[PDB]
Write an enzyme that holds these catalytic residues in place. Structure first.
Site, mmCIF file in Angstrom:
data_model
loop_
_atom_site.group_PDB
_atom_site.id
_atom_site.type_symbol
_atom_site.label_atom_id
_atom_site.label_comp_id
_atom_site.label_asym_id
_atom_site.label_seq_id
_atom_site.Cartn_x
_atom_site.Cartn_y
_atom_site.Cartn_z
ATOM 1 N N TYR A 122 -27.185 -1.752 -35.810
ATOM 2 C CA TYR A 122 -26.708 -2.919 -35.088
ATOM 3 C C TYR A 122 -25.381 -2.621 -34.399
ATOM 4 O O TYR A 122 -25.147 -3.067 -33.281
ATOM 5 C CB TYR A 122 -26.525 -4.124 -36.014
ATOM 6 C CG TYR A 122 -27.785 -4.577 -36.703
ATOM 7 C CD1 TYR A 122 -29.013 -4.573 -36.031
ATOM 8 C CD2 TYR A 122 -27.758 -4.992 -38.032
ATOM 9 C CE1 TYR A 122 -30.177 -4.964 -36.671
ATOM 10 C CE2 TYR A 122 -28.915 -5.385 -38.683
ATOM 11 C CZ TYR A 122 -30.120 -5.367 -37.998
ATOM 12 O OH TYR A 122 -31.271 -5.733 -38.645
ATOM 13 N N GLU A 204 -36.298 -11.437 -46.689
ATOM 14 C CA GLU A 204 -36.939 -10.215 -46.223
ATOM 15 C C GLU A 204 -38.271 -10.506 -45.556
ATOM 16 O O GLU A 204 -38.580 -9.946 -44.511
ATOM 17 C CB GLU A 204 -37.173 -9.246 -47.392
ATOM 18 C CG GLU A 204 -35.917 -8.793 -48.152
ATOM 19 C CD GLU A 204 -35.234 -7.564 -47.564
ATOM 20 O OE1 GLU A 204 -35.764 -6.956 -46.615
ATOM 21 O OE2 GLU A 204 -34.157 -7.196 -48.066
ATOM 22 N N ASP A 237 -39.054 -0.686 -42.583
ATOM 23 C CA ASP A 237 -38.302 -0.727 -43.838
ATOM 24 C C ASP A 237 -38.374 -2.074 -44.534
ATOM 25 O O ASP A 237 -38.619 -2.147 -45.744
ATOM 26 C CB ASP A 237 -36.824 -0.418 -43.617
ATOM 27 C CG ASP A 237 -36.573 1.012 -43.266
ATOM 28 O OD1 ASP A 237 -37.306 1.888 -43.761
ATOM 29 O OD2 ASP A 237 -35.622 1.255 -42.504
ATOM 30 N N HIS A 241 -39.245 -3.314 -48.359
ATOM 31 C CA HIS A 241 -38.418 -4.238 -49.112
ATOM 32 C C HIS A 241 -39.179 -5.459 -49.595
ATOM 33 O O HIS A 241 -39.080 -5.813 -50.766
ATOM 34 C CB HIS A 241 -37.211 -4.670 -48.276
ATOM 35 C CG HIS A 241 -36.362 -3.533 -47.806
ATOM 36 N ND1 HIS A 241 -35.344 -3.696 -46.891
ATOM 37 C CD2 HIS A 241 -36.383 -2.213 -48.116
ATOM 38 C CE1 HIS A 241 -34.777 -2.525 -46.652
ATOM 39 N NE2 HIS A 241 -35.388 -1.608 -47.382
HETATM 40 MN MN MN Z 1 -34.386 -5.549 -46.179
HETATM 41 MN MN MN Z 2 -32.367 -4.532 -43.105
#
Ligand code: MN
Ligand code: MN
Ligand code: HG
Ligand code: HG
Ligand code: HG
Ligand code: HG
Ligand code: HG
Ligand code: HG
Ligand code: HG
Ligand code: HG
Ligand code: MN
Ligand code: MN
Lengths: 339, 339
Positions: A122, A204, A237, A241
């Site tokens: 980011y 998430e 990813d 998670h």
């Molecule tokens: Mn995550």
């Molecule tokens: Mn993340």
């Protein structure tokens, strides 16, 4: 109390995921639940470097964008940066002191580690498409619209952390801190945690996906393609998670890991349920802000809002809960392209 | 109290490394001390996968070895596994709640993360050269010789952690926990921490190197070459780690970060000094155990013991302290080959 290396030679295969004996030896030649060993191996193989992705072409695109299409993009990036700012440190601080099996300990450190890489990506985007990065970062903190959900997220964490300290320092039972009654219940801790776990799952599984939609929308229009490339790696990813949190929650409610948990899971059913409803609602409201000065092609309130419900229904199903919304289909099946 | 996302819009460039405002936004477009940004970038570029290294040829070598040469090897591997078992979780739990600048926060998570990879590499070696890995892991916990230093290491940590909880829960000043006076001093915390930092520095800068010597000795004799290849990668990392701890300590004692620290650094001079002397002595005693049934070519007590002093003198110099030992040279300059 917590110990960085418990002296007792316990059987790590027969310890609960949480609240058991702190993990001593870090071994990976066996595990109670190999889903965690698998996630670690998978996360390690997905390792990627942000600096690699060329976002130079995104500076022009971003500038070209109208002030309302900048709002959407930058606002959504700011929210992503917030989430991962939290997630980078949070799983380590909040969960690490409570794990009692090696695979889950290392998974959480791997998981938190991967979130710091996202934070960096980011920073890589922001400083390459704006001339005053400071404006973006500071607003993440001040922007009262970003903070609505920012404050709700850090409370579940902060509260679990603070209550975990008491448990390690004083133990179960009623205590008095400078003439103040302070009760420490294990059954209460197991609940405080269960809620963070459920709240982390929504973060998430829902919060992040609402951001990939209102992010790939730009990639669909062949705009901000450096960013799309990066967020494609982050989504891969976040998928690992959510697979992890989903397994934790479903291992807890199935009484497979610790019955007292399963019990606390059935008893704390309406909360876990109204916890999601609250999250989904917060993502919808977020939409009113992204489009206060007009929408864009492929993305408006109705589109997004509808995705929030569709996605929320998918996530709660995965953890055995009634679909809080109508059972419809994907308002933007194109999103499956980038995932 | 600790917060996973502090609401205040502070200037992260003007916060102390420790004890200031918890870090909120994870940004990497600037930093107070860029040594930490550099370490992160370097650690990320050193990423390596243990499974890759072929240690199949080490099983035969290890078996061939005499029961006293197995002692040395396996004992040294057990100690390494212990250290990293600790280091994998410890920096996160103990330091994360006290960092107040983003670069140091993320460095510590990266640093702890890399230690879990080392733990895995150890599991990769052990399960590939022995038929009952359980024997090795369990002994790491029970082996009273491994625990001598194991208990001393986790105390500095455990004690700092436990005292950090009180600070976050109650604050500075004198309190009473169920009719018990409990004092919480910031100046005391800054010292408890300063000692872990110094103790962690000795663990990374001395304890680990004594293990690479009594590890590459085998690689010198063309034995255990899969292991040597792996420990070469771990040493490259531990070098990053010691560079980080060295910078922290020297930034604290220079009063550059926080004067009160520098003051507490000069005042707590004999301890920091006798802390090292204690560590070095513990590594020497370790040698009596590795060679209780005979030594091997290129490695015996005098050799090792002499390396411990040589190395200890190097490490304390780097942090401004008198060489506790004679000023001699490297008893095994060949070690520079593998580093
Ligand atoms: Mn995550
Ligand atoms: Mn993340
Ligand atoms: Hg949480
Ligand atoms: Hg969005
Ligand atoms: Hg639930
Ligand atoms: Hg809708
Ligand atoms: Hg320490
Ligand atoms: Hg050794
Ligand atoms: Hg010192
Ligand atoms: Hg000596
Ligand atoms: Mn290590
Ligand atoms: Mn290290």
């Amino acid at each position: 109390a917590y110990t960085t290396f418990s002296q007792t030679k316990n059987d790590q295969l027969k310890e609960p995921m949480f609240f058991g004996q702190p993990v001593n030896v870090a071994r990976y030649d066996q595990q109670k639940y190999d889903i965690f060993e698998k996630l670690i191996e998978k996360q390690l193989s997905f390792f990627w470097r942000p600096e690699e992705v060329d976002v130079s072409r995104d500076r022009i695109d971003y500038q070209a964008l109208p002030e309302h299409e900048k709002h959407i993009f930058i606002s959504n990036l700011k929210y992503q940066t917030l989430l991962d700012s939290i997630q980078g440190r949070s799983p380590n601080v909040a969960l690490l002191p409570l794990i009692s099996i090696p695979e889950l300990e290392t998974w959480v450190e791997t998981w938190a580690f991967s979130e710091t890489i996202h934070s960096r990506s980011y920073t890589h985007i922001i400083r390459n498409i704006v001339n005053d990065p400071s404006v973006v970062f500071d607003d993440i903190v001040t922007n009262e619209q970003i903070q609505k959900r920012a404050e709700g997220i850090s409370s579940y964490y902060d509260e679990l952390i603070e209550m975990t300290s008491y448990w390690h320092l004083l133990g179960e039972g009623t205590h008095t801190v400078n003439g103040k009654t302070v009760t420490v219940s294990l059954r209460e801790l197991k609940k405080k945690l269960y809620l963070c776990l459920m709240s982390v799952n929504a973060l998430e599984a829902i919060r992040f996906y609402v951001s990939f939609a209102c992010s790939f929308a730009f990639a669909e229009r062949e705009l901000m393609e450096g960013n799309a490339k990066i967020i494609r790696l982050i989504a891969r990813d976040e998928a690992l998670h959510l697979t992890g949190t989903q397994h934790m929650l479903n291992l807890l409610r199935s009484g497979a890991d610790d019955p007292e948990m399963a019990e606390i899971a059935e008893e704390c059913k309406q909360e876990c349920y109204d916890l999601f409803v609250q999250a989904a609602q917060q993502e919808k409201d977020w939409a009113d802000y992204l489009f206060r000065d007009g929408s864009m092609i492929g993305l408006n309130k109705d589109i997004l809002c509808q995705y929030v419900e569709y996605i929320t229904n998918i996530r709660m199903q995965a953890v055995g809960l009634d679909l809080p919304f109508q059972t419809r289909s994907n308002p933007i099946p194109w999103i499956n392209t980038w995932l």
